[PDB]
Symmetry: C2
Subunit: 209 residues, 2 copies
């Protein structure tokens, strides 16, 4: 297969976990859906300013903060809609902005600050203004074993990496406005030292944990 350079399925999850542990990002690739999608993925707790800038530069710029229901409930974040008519049930909450520490909310530093506040150990609802320029997604309980989404993969990988169970993701896009396909995702992975792992890889891997 196209991913051999990153290792076997096991080795791929293992190396993704290791990248995260060492403050790098990973490319999570969907192999299994009608539209394949490669996402830039970081552990929220670990993410750096330069990584947020990289993410905005090369992704959709709709940078999502993937969170547990527990976390979502702690922040009193209701779902953006009560009736979700999105094609793949994409789990957006109401959007958020740090109540302190930001200006407009849009800069890489700003988005980071709101992510940091959201995931902070004793984070309170009042810590967040709504709406804003950071887009929380509610992970399905059970992670990739319940829903093979990049949202769930980012949370499962953060946790596998021994971080707080919170991901940051953004879809890799090309400068012409097309979304990256598997070859372009691999090219990007190789050039930015962010290994590729498929949601299948991860799913398989946890089924046996």
């Amino acid at each position: 297969t196209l991913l051999s350079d990153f290792g076997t399925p096991v080795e791929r999850v293992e190396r993704a976990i290791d990248a995260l542990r060492n403050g790098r990002g990973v490319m999570v690739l969907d192999d299994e859906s009608r539209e394949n999608e490669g996402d830039m993925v970081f552990a929220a707790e670990a993410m750096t300013l330069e990584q947020m800038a990289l993410t905005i530069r090369h992704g959709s710029g709709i940078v999502c903060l993937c969170i547990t229901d527990e976390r979502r409930q702690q922040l009193d974040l209701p779902m953006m809609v009560t009736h979700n008519s999105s094609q793949f049930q994409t789990a957006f909450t109401v959007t958020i902005e740090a109540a302190e520490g930001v200006t407009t909310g849009v800069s890489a530093a700003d988005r980071l600050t709101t992510i940091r506040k959201a995931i902070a150990d004793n984070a309170k609802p009042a810590d967040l203004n709504r709406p804003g320029h950071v887009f929380p997604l509610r992970g399905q309980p059970g992670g990739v074993l319940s829903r093979r989404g990049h949202t769930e993969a980012s949370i499962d990988l953060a946790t596998l990496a021994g971080y707080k169970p919170a991901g940051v993701l953004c879809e890799l896009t090309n400068d012409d406005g097309s979304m990256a396909h598997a070859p372009e995702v691999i090219a990007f992975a190789k050039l930015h030292d962010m290994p590729v792992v498929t949601i299948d890889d991860l799913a398989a891997y946890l089924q046996s944990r």
Copy 2:
């Protein structure tokens, strides 16, 4: 900023840019946080423009719409009580898209939204295009980029709907006035300030 003209010549030139299927840089030079946004008339925006806008902006590409339009589409406000910016619930085209995130797809969503006989069922929620409700009265009521985009579309003879995105640098900092000017000059997208536009409308 005199490279672009006088205050009146700046609004006249922005309007013309839009008329001819180009973008404009709308600059806030009166708030504490100065901000330059890429601005297009919705009805006129092309694919290459949507790509440019994702590439160099925040990527949070907003569709600025009248209250009329928002109620035609049965778009409630995202929040019932705003602690923040007038975000509506977010939208995807119900037909004609896949994931919604490509430049082609965002455009297809925008086109469905502003189309003459658009109905709520035309849009799935949530999605990856972010409508913003303009305040009644435009810039004369609220000197925001959201209002400016709608007032410029209208001045330019389009449906009263803008697309906007905040210009960002590759290092994740937001563009300031020098950078907004450089980008404008490089992409043939004229700079106009919200003050410029407000004055021009007052008359």
